[PDB]
Symmetry: C5
Subunit: 103 residues, 5 copies
């Protein structure tokens, strides 16, 4: 059972860590059909998505996808520094699997 | 697989982008029957709705409609700048499909 | 499709607008059986309730009732100014149908 | 239909009102099995619980129990003053039925 | 019922109290399949998890697990002082059973 985001990220294929150490620059969310997703950017130009729930996700990820969008919204609004994102790099924008926040 | 609200908005019929770059001026919410909806305005006089869930919405949009009203409420209370709205222009008030928040 | 709370309120019988332009003075919440409700007051004494869900409510109102109590609690804690309430005046306390926040 | 927490409390057997007019001193919450509950204390030592959902509860109370634990947490974190609690007397700690918050 | 986290903790096998009296240093959460979990750390090096929901959990614990991750995120973002954690010490990182917050 992993002790940090880097070790967690390494348990999966097609992932990587992006280190941001910065607040979120913009937060976007959509209710449009088949694009029920969130998109965040950072001032360095990096863009990430929380994917639309799909057949790629198992049932236990459903609640966590919803939570992640909650987390990104409040992080954005509080200007919380994002340390790292673990992302799947076989999607464009890279798809968020995990987030760490630290000052 | 869009990277921003403008490219997302462009995937749908009967939509357009409004650029606000302003905080929400007023936030209204109703629990009355058949009008379970939210309405927001900006100081420029613009009015937008989150529509009552209906037959025009597929299942996956229902959860995202609830999220959007949560987003608008907290955006309003924190005086967060709304960058852009993607809206359907075949409804009055124009109906929100997506929001971006920046600055 | 309503442009504002006054127009929305006018679509229903037994309603009226109260214009408060003030923050909520007190917030009360109960989980007692058959009294699962919220009550708010303003400094002048005017009292309003979010009614216990009952057979007068259609299914779509259930989520909106829960949303309204969430809204009143955060409005209270943030000292947000309530502009207007649309209420049913065939109940005591008058029962909230919609709320507008501005200023 | 009660105007305030004192009148609501008086509708029930084994209840009493505690007048605190003070912020929550401590907030405790548990996910351990059969102890899925919250406990709060005030600086005077008075201690209160939100009971684990049980056969004493009716269905309409389930969502309100969850809401009450939400309210207690955010009240604690914002240092909001608690005016009164209506509690059941026949449990230790006394079990919260209702809360009022006021300036 | 228990009046405090220490008494609550002692009701269970394989638990202990950690006394932190410090804000959370880092907050991590994951939506990756089979690792839908949260991890927190403190400046003293201590690391804790909210376990992925599984067969060891009774159904009533499920909502409480989701609540705990909510609480840890907001505690982190508000820099709220964590007093104590009750944990299962038969897991690595130690698994959170309960939390107490006090200033």
């Amino acid at each position: 059972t992993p002790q940090n985001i880097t070790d967690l990220c390494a348990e999966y294929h097609n992932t990587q860590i992006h280190t941001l150490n910065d607040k979120i620059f913009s937060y976007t969310e959509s209710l449009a059909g088949k694009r029920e997703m969130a998109i965040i950017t950072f001032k360095n130009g990096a863009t990430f998505q929380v994917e639309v729930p799909g057949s790629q996700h198992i049932d236990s990820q459903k609640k966590a996808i919803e939570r992640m969008k909650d987390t990104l919204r409040i992080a954005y609004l509080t200007e919380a520094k994002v340390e790292k994102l673990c992302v799947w790099n076989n999607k464009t924008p890279h798809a968020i699997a995990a987030i760490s926040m630290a000052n």
